[PDB]
Amino acid sequence: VTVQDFFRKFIEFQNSPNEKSLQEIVKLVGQLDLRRFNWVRDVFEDIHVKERGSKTALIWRDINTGEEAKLSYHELSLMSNRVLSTLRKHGLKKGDVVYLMTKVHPMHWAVFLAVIKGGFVMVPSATNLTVAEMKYRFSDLKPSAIISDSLRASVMEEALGSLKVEKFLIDGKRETWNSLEDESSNAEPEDTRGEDVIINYFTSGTTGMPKRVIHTAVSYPVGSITTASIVGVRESDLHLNLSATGWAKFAWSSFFSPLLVGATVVGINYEGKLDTRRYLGEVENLGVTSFCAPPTAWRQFITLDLDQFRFERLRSVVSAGEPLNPEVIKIWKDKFNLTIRDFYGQTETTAMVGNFPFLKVKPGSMGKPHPLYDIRLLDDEGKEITKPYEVGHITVKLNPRPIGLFLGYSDEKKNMESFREGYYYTGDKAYFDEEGYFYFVGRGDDVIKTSDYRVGPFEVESALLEHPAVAEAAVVGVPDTVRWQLVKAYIVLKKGYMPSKELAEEIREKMKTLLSPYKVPRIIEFVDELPKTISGKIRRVELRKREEEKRKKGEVGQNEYV
Amino acid sequence: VTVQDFFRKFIEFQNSPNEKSLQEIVKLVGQLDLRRFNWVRDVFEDIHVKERGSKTALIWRDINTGEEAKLSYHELSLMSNRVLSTLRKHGLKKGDVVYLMTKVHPMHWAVFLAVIKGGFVMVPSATNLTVAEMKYRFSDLKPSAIISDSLRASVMEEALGSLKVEKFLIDGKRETWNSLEDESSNAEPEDTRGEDVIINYFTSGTTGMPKRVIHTAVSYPVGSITTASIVGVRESDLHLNLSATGWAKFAWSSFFSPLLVGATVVGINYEGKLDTRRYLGEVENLGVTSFCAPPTAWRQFITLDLDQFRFERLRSVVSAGEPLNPEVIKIWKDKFNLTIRDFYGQTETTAMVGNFPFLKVKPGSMGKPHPLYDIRLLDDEGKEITKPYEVGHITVKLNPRPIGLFLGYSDEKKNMESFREGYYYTGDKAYFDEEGYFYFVGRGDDVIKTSDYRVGPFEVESALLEHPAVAEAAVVGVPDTVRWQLVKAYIVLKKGYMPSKELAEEIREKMKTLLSPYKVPRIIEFVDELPKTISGKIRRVELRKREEEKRKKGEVGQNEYV
Numbered sequence A, B: 001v002t003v004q005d006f007f008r009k010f011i012e013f014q015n016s017p018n019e020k021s022l023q024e025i026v027k028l029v030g031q032l033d034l035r036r037f038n039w040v041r042d043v044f045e046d047i048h049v050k051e052r053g054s055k056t057a058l059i060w061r062d063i064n065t066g067e068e069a070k071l072s073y074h075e076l077s078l079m080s081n082r083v084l085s086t087l088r089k090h091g092l093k094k095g096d097v098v099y100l101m102t103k104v105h106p107m108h109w110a111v112f113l114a115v116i117k118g119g120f121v122m123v124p125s126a127t128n129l130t131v132a133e134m135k136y137r138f139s140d141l142k143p144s145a146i147i148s149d150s151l152r153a154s155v156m157e158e159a160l161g162s163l164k165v166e167k168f169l170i171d172g173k174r175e176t177w178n179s180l181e182d183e184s185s186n187a188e189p190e191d192t193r194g195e196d197v198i199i200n201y202f203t204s205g206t207t208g209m210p211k212r213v214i215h216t217a218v219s220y221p222v223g224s225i226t227t228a229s230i231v232g233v234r235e236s237d238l239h240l241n242l243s244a245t246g247w248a249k250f251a252w253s254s255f256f257s258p259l260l261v262g263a264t265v266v267g268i269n270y271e272g273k274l275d276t277r278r279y280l281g282e283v284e285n286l287g288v289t290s291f292c293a294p295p296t297a298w299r300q301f302i303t304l305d306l307d308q309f310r311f312e313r314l315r316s317v318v319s320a321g322e323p324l325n326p327e328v329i330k331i332w333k334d335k336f337n338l339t340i341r342d343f344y345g346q347t348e349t350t351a352m353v354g355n356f357p358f359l360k361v362k363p364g365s366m367g368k369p370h371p372l373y374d375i376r377l378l379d380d381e382g383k384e385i386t387k388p389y390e391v392g393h394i395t396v397k398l399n400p401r402p403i404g405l406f407l408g409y410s411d412e413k414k415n416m417e418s419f420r421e422g423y424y425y426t427g428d429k430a431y432f433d434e435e436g437y438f439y440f441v442g443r444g445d446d447v448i449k450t451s452d453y454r455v456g457p458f459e460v461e462s463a464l465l466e467h468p469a470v471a472e473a474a475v476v477g478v479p480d481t482v483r484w485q486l487v488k489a490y491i492v493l494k495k496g497y498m499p500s501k502e503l504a505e506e507i508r509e510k511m512k513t514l515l516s517p518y519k520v521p522r523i524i525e526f527v528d529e530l531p532k533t534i535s536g537k538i539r540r541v542e543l544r545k546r547e548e549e550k551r552k553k554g555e556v557g558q559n560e561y562v
């Protein structure tokens, strides 16, 4: 059965989700022939622009400015077509690289479209990212094209240095900043193969510097159905996602999940800190019926006087990126008679397990796996677990290779580490419930996750060695209640340098310069020796055990705490 | 410990080498003040011209022509002085760039002198190099000055069509052909600092087009003692090296090592292919007592009826630039009671490990490292190895940064790759013997070495893409017994072109045009698609695996083999 038939049948299943009907959809995925496939052409245009061309596709609000905008599927399609023209016009061919660094803005959605439509490789780039970070990224994947909002432009320029490349803006600017909107014509689909790459996410890894996860014109564009399945997004729905541009969750709940079902997207852009109340006021005042927010946000929402809210038209509420304490779910349920449904997955994939709408949520459980993923819980030496309450690594079986699973990393050795002989390793660790539920326990990696931002040690460590006074560094995750973890840095000095709170200050402010804010360590401890195995490897694990002991007792040595 | 005292004590140590006396020399080096240092002034003139002025310094023979020559150290100093005058006279200053492309000829050695004496930066250029390649070189580093023999005048001219720069010859031709023999006077040493650059070698890289390694008026001229200690060369010696002009091995064993000890140099010039027998005939017929030859030559020498030679006054025989097969050493030893002592190094360095004369040779082994270099065998994650039979990368420690070690490359990123955190990477891989011997296993690079010529893929791949019929190319080294590896080229055709031994021929002839002989592929295999990672990287690894399996089973499959 045809591409278009598939998606419509899914949409109907969304309007009343049920396990049987899910099993049906699962088989139908098995039948799809995706060998040459362009999502914009085949689904956006062919279904939604056809059948919903005049339906309002996106509603956008800048909290800071007040600026409002609303675009219909048609208006939107022509916008995307203009950009695709303007890209080809400034000399871009399929497979060419496009960095995208913008605020939440209608033109962000236009550019996502252009890129899928034109079969280009886009690199979503956060707006936190520092010139340093951008120069690394370019060094890894050199850019054919650059697109930025006015405020993030100065950073991109400086990072490029000598590189000459196409430079585009969403606003109006002084020099080599041409607007994307020019020609509707020349909006011809690229015939892209399903297995063609269109997106490169720069994801943080344990061992080293962040590399790229590689997503095809089928992996995300259709795999995202797993996500939608768990959230319960329908055609009627107004959908809202609290995610930053430059990351997957954006692609998941802000872009693909709503637009698959022809829903109305709601995009709220703010600079700086989350006005927790003002935000929820917009939610209520725009009548959003489907809402996904990272746990860190939910944590902030609870602390408010919630009596001032009557979330009148709110139907679906979800969470993903970090653990969600039952206590939070309870308070929200108590105040509004809605449950927040925790779901799981990685930049590397789409939604993997979760509390579907028709599933009795178990608090703090993420829930049950999606049947399209072949989810296995392996012990050491890859024996999949039966015993419910026993802990192990979380893995995808590749034998039937799930769609949604990224083609693989940019760094073939991390490919060899992660992919093990019929299994992909997420590295994360969990246990089964008798009833086949899933409770996240933590990360096998040395990976840190603060405020839904995944940070890998080496990024910060190497940043630290940039200071004259630093001979060795070790970056670890510390428990925090608000953001799930915090960044701690153990440091060993050169001769001459003495350990001082004044010095810790100095180093940290240098790091502000180099690292994205979420990455600047909130704690700096000067030490003598770092724990090492014989090999010479740093036992960061051992540092965290040390920190568990310290926190049971209330210890602090010469740690500086900011 | 004065400069001159040092070298005379070194010469004595050469007359009977021993580990004790070596360790002593090592300390004495530590004491030298070479902060301003000119090799010709301080060593050539001061020691040899003074005390060996009338000693025959060089004997030169052209096999083909029959032309014979003999020059004393004085005659030679006068020669160098003439040219240096003539260079200054035509407007050359210290730090000026001088390309040198000649056949083995006394004036080659005169010009080497002039250059070091005048503090000029020379680019030794083999006489193979194509007009194409020379245009590359000039593009990278502009020439002040050019010196060529009669025959390759043509080629330089065409590459130098570009500009007017000072142009000089070893013979007598019509246009911009100034002899360097004009004036002895103005032969005044340039006050060169130890760390001043005098030699720039264009060396082939794995990833890309060749860059330049940078050598000072101390690195080679005195680091060359590593080399000379290893090949036990003496004052009394008649020394011969089989190397092509325009590469390191020449500077090492043909120029610096002999002239350090005030030996008698022997230069044999031949055009085209090595008359394996006729060459050795000249060796015996001249009474060479110390001889160095690349392994590829030794391999050719074995195949002879060796009974027809009685190598009467031959004392030292040595090898370098490739592995030396035990079989070869054995056959030569059996026939002549001489061992061929395999030593090692890079254009980047001087001799680093070798079979010193006082060392019991282990077949296949390079031998033991030279004490001037801190040689380390690091595993992945740079943990120096203890376990003897364990393969790792070969690295120099920079802690005290050994002299002889090139300042660095012309390209800062290859500098960042190679020089890693207290260590320079040769990239080469080897293992220890219990007793601290060293057995080269291969290159970590995708680098090829044929007949002691170090060839880099990208040069040749790009050269191939120049052909109309070539869509994709991939260059790999295949085993050969005579040359250590051979150049194989995997090609993906454009549509229309049909694979044929005749098409392979056509491409080969075009490559003769663009690339130096050692770089023309000896094999062309037309294939459909090449194996690649997700990234788009060509898995050369995978190519060689394929070829070793094909050769174990004895198969081919539309490869054309010249």
Ligand SMILES: CC(C)(COP(=O)(O)OP(=O)(O)OC[C@H]1O[C@@H](n2cnc3c(N)ncnc32)[C@H](O)[C@@H]1OP(=O)(O)O)[C@@H](O)C(=O)NCCC(=O)NCCS
Pocket: A127, A128, A129, A242, A243, A244, A245, A247, A248, A249, A250, A272, A273, A274, A275, A294, A296, A297, A321, A347, A451, A452, A453, A454, A517, A518
């Ligand atoms: C969950 C979330 C809303 C938390 O609310 P928040 O407190 O406003 O968010 P953050 O702490 O991350 O960032 C705001 C804070 O950092 C500062 N900040 C961060 N980046 C900044 C930037 N580029 N410019 C200015 N300030 C910045 C803000 O001023 C504020 O300061 P504070 O730390 O003293 O509060 C927010 O972190 C978020 O959206 N997370 C990212 C979700 C995501 O897509 N991650 C990847 C998953 S695939």
Ligand SMILES: CC(C)(COP(=O)(O)OP(=O)(O)OC[C@H]1O[C@@H](n2cnc3c(N)ncnc32)[C@H](O)[C@@H]1OP(=O)(O)O)[C@@H](O)C(=O)NCCC(=O)NCCS
Pocket: B127, B128, B129, B242, B243, B244, B245, B247, B248, B249, B250, B271, B272, B273, B274, B275, B294, B296, B297, B321, B451, B452, B453, B454, B517, B518
């Ligand atoms: C090792 C060596 C002596 C082997 O001798 P050889 O086998 O006669 O040499 P080669 O095969 O490389 O070159 C001779 C062949 O190439 C051709 N050739 C190579 N360069 C040539 C040139 N500049 N002009 C003419 N012919 C040339 C010859 O005609 C001959 O072809 P043939 O074998 O079909 O008759 C030779 O490779 C050599 O001198 N190598 C240099 C070592 C060196 O300096 N290393 C560089 C890095 S340190």
Ligand SMILES: CC(=O)OP(=O)(O)OC[C@H]1O[C@@H](n2cnc3c(N)ncnc32)[C@H](O)[C@@H]1O
Pocket: A203, A248, A249, A319, A320, A321, A322, A323, A324, A342, A343, A344, A345, A346, A347, A348, A366, A426, A428, A440, A443, A449, A452, A453, A454
């Ligand atoms: C979309 C996204 O988050 O991708 P990314 O930023 O790459 O993070 C990936 C890591 O997030 C953690 N994670 C995600 N969902 C979670 C959940 N429901 N409960 C607990 N942990 C969760 C895991 O540890 C993953 O490995």
Ligand SMILES: CC(=O)OP(=O)(O)OC[C@H]1O[C@@H](n2cnc3c(N)ncnc32)[C@H](O)[C@@H]1O
Pocket: B203, B248, B249, B319, B320, B321, B322, B323, B324, B342, B343, B344, B345, B346, B347, B348, B366, B426, B428, B440, B442, B443, B449, B452, B453, B454
């Ligand atoms: C002087 C010269 O030849 O330098 P150069 O042309 O730059 O090449 C350097 C490369 O030659 C190889 N090499 C040199 N000596 C060797 C030996 N004894 N055994 C095995 N391999 C050897 C290595 O692989 C080097 O990395």
